[PDB]
Every structure is written in C-alpha cells, then in structure tokens.
C-alpha cells in the first residue's frame, strides 16, 4: 500500500539503496498504489559506484508490499517490507541487471517480462 512520502527498499542492483515515493502515478486524486503500479520516486541514497546517484528522480515499479498481493481464491502473499525496481524514466524497462527477491505473479504484463525473467522464485 504505497503512498506519498513512503520510503522503499531498492529491489535491484541499480546502485540505489533507499528510495522514497514522492508521487503516485495513474489517475486523478489517486492515493494508494502497489502490486505493480508505476510510481515516480526520488533516490535518497545510493552506493558510490552505482549507475544512479543521490537526488535522482525517476519512475519505478513496485514489486513487493507489506499489505501483500491479493488472489482470486482469497489468498494473499504478504512481504516483510516494500520494494521496487527502477525502470527507465523515458520508456520503462529496468535499469539494474539483477532484480533481487521474489517478484509477484501480477507483474505478468508484457512490459514487466524483463523483470520476472530474473529472480528464479515465483
């Protein structure tokens, strides 16, 4: 259940460490976001040799949420912490060469195929 001013763990080797959801993309007066919805984010922290640096702002896709992703059977897959992969701001597609952690099944949506191609679990 991502919202404005929400810190998130980085989900890939983009070199970023901590991020924050400054804005929630996708519709007027929108509040909550998650599952796989795009959210533009600032980079509050990054490792020195990473592709990205501190203060960078770019769109990124949520991959994990504490609320978890719901399923038609009623089952839900909760996670200990939020995470997101840093898509390129210009035309999607992840920047990192390796996405850590088990991406959820809901990512299956053409454009996110590159992300789920990595990380053997789920």
């Amino acid at each position: 259940m991502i919202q404005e001013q929400t810190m998130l763990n980085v989900a890939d080797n983009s070199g970023a460490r901590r991020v924050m959801c400054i804005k929630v993309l996708g519709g007027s007066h929108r509040r909550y976001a998650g599952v796989g919805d795009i959210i533009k984010i600032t980079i509050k922290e990054a490792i020195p040799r990473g592709k990205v640096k501190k203060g960078d702002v770019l769109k990124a896709v949520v991959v994990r949420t504490k609320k978890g992703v719901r399923r038609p059977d009623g089952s839900v897959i909760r996670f200990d912490g939020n995470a997101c992969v840093l898509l390129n701001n210009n035309s999607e597609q992840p920047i990192g060469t390796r996405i850590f952690g088990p991406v959820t099944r809901e990512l299956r949506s053409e454009k996110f195929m590159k992300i789920i191609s990595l990380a053997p679990e789920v």
């Binding site: 399923r71 089952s75 909760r78 912490g81 850590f100 088990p102």
Partner: protein, 114 residues
C-alpha cells in the same frame, strides 16, 4: 443456518491432515504460467491457524532470499493441493506473530517428538 452448513460441508474436502501450529509444512500450489498449469512447492512453518469450517485458512511464513514471505491458504480452496507435514514440532501459544520480528537463530522451533 442448517441450510448454510449443509451447503458448506458438501464442498469441504475430507483429506486434510491434522497439523500443530509452528510445524514445518509444504504447501503445493497450482498456478497458471501464462499457459501450462505447472504446480509449485511452498514449504514453510505455520504461524497462524484460523479454523472457520469451510472458511478455514492458515498462514505460512517462508524466509527466502532475505526478507520473509508469509502466505495464507484456504483449507478447501481448489488451488491448494497436498499439505504434507515435513517436520514434527511444538510451541506454546498457537499464534506466532512474535516470530515476525525474530530472525535467524531466533526462528528456531523444537520438535514435538511424540
């Protein structure tokens, strides 16, 4: 009332093994992969059982590649398959939310051995 319970019991499966909370329990899960309906395993210690007749379900945590991954499962849902108990065990207090903070060696559970 009885019209409800009769409707519920008919849909209930009769092949559910008993299991104590805190036991390690694999949970097979059928899932579409965009085509083939391959089954997938999901082993993990139980932390929260919730019996509600047909509505009964149980949480299953699994600490993988860093942060843990809890997953609830309906007992009677078609999606779930075998519910084997890979490891006998026992803990006081059926709820185990406190384990969510505990990690590594703190996550140990003694075998019931009886």
């Amino acid at each position: 009332s009885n019209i409800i319970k009769q409707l519920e019991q008919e849909q209930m499966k009769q092949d559910v093994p008993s299991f104590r909370p805190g036991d390690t329990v694999e949970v097979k899960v059928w899932v579409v992969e965009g085509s083939k309906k391959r089954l997938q395993a999901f082993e993990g210690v139980v932390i929260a059982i919730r019996n509600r007749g047909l509505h009964s379900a149980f949480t299953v945590r699994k600490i993988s590649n860093g942060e843990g991954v809890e997953r609830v499962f309906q007992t009677h849902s078609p999606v779930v398959d075998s519910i084997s108990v890979k490891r006998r065990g026992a803990v006081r207090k059926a709820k185990l939310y406190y384990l969510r903070e505990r990690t590594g060696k703190a996550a140990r559970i003694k075998e019931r051995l009886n």
